[PDB]
Amino acid sequence: TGVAPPPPGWTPPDRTPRAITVRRLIEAPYRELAGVIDPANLQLLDVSA
Amino acid sequence: TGVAPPPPGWTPPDRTPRAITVRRLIEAPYRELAGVIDPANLQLLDVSA
Protein backbone atom coordinates (compact mmCIF):
# COMPACT_ATOMS: atom_id res chain seq x y z
CA THR A 1 0.00 0.00 0.00
CA GLY A 2 0.94 3.66 -0.28
CA VAL A 3 -0.46 5.25 2.86
CA ALA A 4 1.34 4.70 6.17
CA PRO A 5 -0.07 4.86 9.71
CA PRO A 6 1.42 7.65 11.85
CA PRO A 7 2.26 7.24 15.56
CA PRO A 8 -0.61 9.11 17.24
CA GLY A 9 -1.95 6.92 20.03
CA TRP A 10 -2.52 8.16 23.58
CA THR A 11 0.88 9.70 24.41
CA PRO A 12 0.95 8.47 28.03
CA PRO A 13 2.21 11.00 30.59
CA ASP A 14 5.85 10.50 31.57
CA ARG A 15 5.59 10.53 35.35
CA THR A 16 8.56 8.21 36.04
CA PRO A 17 9.71 10.04 39.21
CA ARG A 18 13.18 11.61 39.02
CA ALA A 19 15.57 12.45 41.83
CA ILE A 20 15.71 16.04 43.06
CA THR A 21 18.59 18.02 41.55
CA VAL A 22 18.27 21.30 43.50
CA ARG A 23 18.01 21.17 47.29
CA ARG A 24 19.61 22.40 50.51
CA LEU A 25 19.78 21.79 54.25
CA ILE A 26 19.66 24.53 56.89
CA GLU A 27 19.44 25.06 60.65
CA ALA A 28 16.26 26.69 61.93
CA PRO A 29 17.03 30.03 63.65
CA TYR A 30 15.20 31.25 66.73
CA ARG A 31 12.79 33.26 64.57
CA GLU A 32 10.72 30.26 63.49
CA LEU A 33 10.90 28.44 66.83
CA ALA A 34 9.53 31.58 68.48
CA GLY A 35 6.46 31.59 66.23
CA VAL A 36 5.88 27.83 66.00
CA ILE A 37 6.64 26.69 69.57
CA ASP A 38 4.53 27.71 72.55
CA PRO A 39 6.29 29.80 75.23
CA ALA A 40 5.88 27.16 77.94
CA ASN A 41 7.90 24.57 76.02
CA LEU A 42 10.21 27.16 74.42
CA GLN A 43 11.45 28.63 77.70
CA LEU A 44 12.62 25.18 78.84
CA LEU A 45 14.71 24.76 75.68
CA ASP A 46 18.43 24.78 76.41
CA VAL A 47 20.87 27.03 74.57
CA SER A 48 22.36 24.01 72.77
CA ALA A 49 19.11 22.93 71.10
CA THR B 1 -40.71 -29.41 35.63
CA GLY B 2 -37.51 -31.34 36.23
CA VAL B 3 -34.82 -28.68 36.54
CA ALA B 4 -34.60 -26.66 39.76
CA PRO B 5 -33.14 -23.18 40.30
CA PRO B 6 -30.09 -23.11 42.60
CA PRO B 7 -29.46 -20.36 45.17
CA PRO B 8 -26.74 -18.28 43.48
CA GLY B 9 -27.74 -14.63 43.76
CA TRP B 10 -25.39 -11.91 45.00
CA THR B 11 -24.21 -13.37 48.33
CA PRO B 12 -24.26 -10.04 50.22
CA PRO B 13 -21.29 -9.44 52.53
CA ASP B 14 -22.02 -10.20 56.18
CA ARG B 15 -20.78 -7.02 57.84
CA THR B 16 -23.20 -7.07 60.81
CA PRO B 17 -20.68 -5.67 63.34
CA ARG B 18 -19.80 -8.00 66.22
CA ALA B 19 -18.51 -7.15 69.67
CA ILE B 20 -14.78 -7.45 70.33
CA THR B 21 -13.83 -10.72 72.03
CA VAL B 22 -10.10 -10.11 72.65
CA ARG B 23 -9.02 -6.87 74.31
CA ARG B 24 -7.11 -5.44 77.27
CA LEU B 25 -6.56 -2.28 79.31
CA ILE B 26 -3.15 -1.02 80.45
CA GLU B 27 -1.46 1.95 82.12
CA ALA B 28 0.95 3.93 79.96
CA PRO B 29 4.50 3.81 81.41
CA TYR B 30 6.88 6.75 81.33
CA ARG B 31 8.47 5.46 78.12
CA GLU B 32 5.63 6.59 75.85
CA LEU B 33 4.93 9.83 77.71
CA ALA B 34 8.60 10.74 77.27
CA GLY B 35 8.39 10.37 73.49
CA VAL B 36 4.87 11.75 72.96
CA ILE B 37 4.79 14.68 75.41
CA ASP B 38 6.99 17.74 75.04
CA PRO B 39 9.51 18.36 77.86
CA ALA B 40 7.93 21.67 78.91
CA ASN B 41 4.60 20.04 79.76
CA LEU B 42 6.17 16.76 80.91
CA GLN B 43 8.37 18.33 83.59
CA LEU B 44 5.31 19.89 85.24
CA LEU B 45 3.62 16.48 85.49
CA ASP B 46 3.29 15.30 89.09
CA VAL B 47 4.47 11.88 90.23
CA SER B 48 0.84 10.75 90.70
CA ALA B 49 -0.19 11.31 87.07
B39 touches chain A (CB under 8 A): yes
- A18: distance to nearest CA of chain B, Å? 35
Asked if B43 contacts A44 with a C-beta cutoff of 8 angstroms, the reply is: yes
The coordinates were experimentally obtained by cryo-EM
Breaks in chain A at C–N > 2.5 Å: after which residues? none
How would you class B24 by CB atoms within 10 Å of its CB: exposed for 0-12, middle for 13-18, buried for 19 or more?
exposed
What is the resolution in angstroms? 4.5
Cα A42 to Cα A23, B3, B5, B33, B47: the distances in Å are 29, 81, 75, 18, 23
Determine contact, residues A33/B32, Cβ cutoff 8 Å: no
Residue A44: closest CA among B38, B23, B2, B25:
B38
Q: Does A42 touch chain B (CB under 8 A)?
A: yes
Residues 6+ apart with CB under 8 A from B45: B33, B37
